[PDB]
UniProtKB/Swiss-Prot annotation:
<protein>
    <recommendedName>
        <fullName>Glutaredoxin-3</fullName>
    </recommendedName>
</protein>
<feature type="modified residue" description="Phosphoserine">
    <location>
        <position position="107"/>
    </location>
</feature>
<feature type="modified residue" description="Phosphoserine">
    <location>
        <position position="110"/>
    </location>
</feature>
<comment type="subunit">
    <text>Homodimer; the homodimer is independent of 2Fe-2S clusters. Heterotrimer; forms a heterotrimeric complex composed by two BOLA2 molecules and one GLRX3 molecule; linked by [2Fe-2S] clusters. Interacts (via N-terminus) with PRKCQ/PKC-theta. Interacts (via C-terminus) with CSRP3. Interacts with CSRP2.</text>
</comment>
<feature type="domain" description="Thioredoxin">
    <location>
        <begin position="1"/>
        <end position="107"/>
    </location>
</feature>
<comment type="function">
    <text>Together with BOLA2, acts as a cytosolic iron-sulfur (Fe-S) cluster assembly factor that facilitates [2Fe-2S] cluster insertion into a subset of cytosolic proteins. Acts as a critical negative regulator of cardiac hypertrophy and a positive inotropic regulator. Required for hemoglobin maturation. Does not possess any thyoredoxin activity since it lacks the conserved motif that is essential for catalytic activity.</text>
</comment>
Length: 120
């Protein structure tokens, strides 16, 4: 859905395995948090610019065993994974910084030189 939702520890474990050879960005989110509404929109734009990268969301309160493992006490928290290892983290709704970390970890050539903007 641009940003697929992971609904259980089992699905998360499988996802990490499936996506081992590429970058995976996980937005730990809450459906009541305006921070996360802002950042889901950012994640959807990233997802279009970087189809090599997997962008998913996981409801922190809905999968609490995963949240506890990864020390998720607030949302948004973004975790970055390659080969089932956490390689980076961002706490809070900081759009430019999310994008900077994604660009740092994404492969060279993963994006075109420009992105279309909506000017209204």
């Amino acid at each position: 859905a641009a940003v697929e939702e992971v609904g259980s520890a089992g699905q998360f474990e499988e996802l990490l395995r499936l996506k081992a050879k590429s970058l995976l960005v996980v937005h730990f989110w809450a459906p009541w948090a305006p921070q996360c509404a802002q950042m889901n929109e950012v994640m959807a734009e990233l997802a279009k610019e970087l189809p090599q990268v997997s962008f998913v969301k996981l409801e922190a309160e809905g999968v609490p065993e995963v949240s506890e493992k990864y020390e998720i006490s607030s949302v948004p928290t973004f975790l970055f994974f390659k080969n089932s290892q956490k390689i980076d983290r961002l706490d809070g709704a900081h759009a430019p910084e999310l994008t900077k970390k994604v660009q740092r970890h994404a492969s060279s050539g993963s994006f075109l030189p420009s992105a279309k903007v909506k000017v209204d």
